Amino acid sequence: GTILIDLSPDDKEFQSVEEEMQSTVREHRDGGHAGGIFNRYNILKIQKVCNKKLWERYTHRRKEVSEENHNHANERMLFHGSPFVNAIIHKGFDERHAYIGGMFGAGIYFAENSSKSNQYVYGIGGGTGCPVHKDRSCYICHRQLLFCRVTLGKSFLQFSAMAHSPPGHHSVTGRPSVNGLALAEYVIYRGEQAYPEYLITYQIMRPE
Numbered sequence: 001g002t003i004l005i006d007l008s009p010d011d012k013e014f015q016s017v018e019e020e021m022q023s024t025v026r027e028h029r030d031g032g033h034a035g036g037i038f039n040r041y042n043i044l045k046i047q048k049v050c051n052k053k054l055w056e057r058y059t060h061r062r063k064e065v066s067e068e069n070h071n072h073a074n075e076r077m078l079f080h081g082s083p084f085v086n087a088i089i090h091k092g093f094d095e096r097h098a099y100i101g102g103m104f105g106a107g108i109y110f111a112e113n114s115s116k117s118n119q120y121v122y123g124i125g126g127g128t129g130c131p132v133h134k135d136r137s138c139y140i141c142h143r144q145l146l147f148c149r150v151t152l153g154k155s156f157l158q159f160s161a162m163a164h165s166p167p168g169h170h171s172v173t174g175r176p177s178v179n180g181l182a183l184a185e186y187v188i189y190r191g192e193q194a195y196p197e198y199l200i201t202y203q204i205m206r207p208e
């Protein structure tokens with residue numbers, strides 16, 4: 001049921017998505033070990049992901065959460081990186097997309113920083129890097145990230161120096177608590193709480 005519609009670079013939707021990708025790059029504490037060394041991306045393509053069934057699954061859950069939270073879904077647009085992005089766009093998120101060893105328990109993780117999600121495109125800690133060159137900092141191979149609509153509802157705030165949500169909450173927020181420049185990370189424990197809205201194909205760029 002999934003179709004991918006290419007956005008034109010002249011389209012304001014393309015432009016606002018590219019800006020969120022570019023403007024949320026930061027330096028990482030591993031100096032680029034996991035995701036590579038770069039300050040920006042070369043964006044090759046942005047596709048809209050269209051799946052009626054998966055959309056209806058998202059909006060149904062969004063309505064449940066909202067009615068549990070004074071009519072407030074607390075919906076965000078967040079990045080997700082994974083070796084399985086091509087399964088996600090066809091089948092949606094579910095328990096097999098969870099990060100079992102994540103710092104906030106076995107759930108599905110999303111980032112405000114695009115460069116954080118970039119660290120997981122080739123697997124946990126960047127795995128062994130690109131499949132062609134075995135290079136975590138490959139500047140040639142094409143990478144893909146998702147930019148997703150995510151329902152957080154009432155989020156449990158964890159100050160930070162599938163399982164269940166903490167009782168009375170619909171998600172967990174990982175608040176950066178040492179690195180003053182890092183943006184938040186978020187965890188959901190139900191795959192129906194995210195819809196993978198854009199597929200972004202890119203390369204990381206070598207600093208000049």
Ligand SMILES: Cc1cccc2c(=O)[nH]c(-c3ccc(CN4CCCC4)cc3)cc12
Nearest residue numbers: 080081082097098099109110111117120185
């Ligand atoms: C911890 C964290 C913070 C912020 C963003 C992300 C993210 O985008 N992906 C991931 C991530 C981690 C692992 C996996 C895939 N594992 C591979 C076997 C199934 C789960 C997929 C995505 C983690 C993450």
Ligand SMILES: [Zn+2]
Nearest residue numbers: 130133138141
């Ligand atoms: Zn490569």
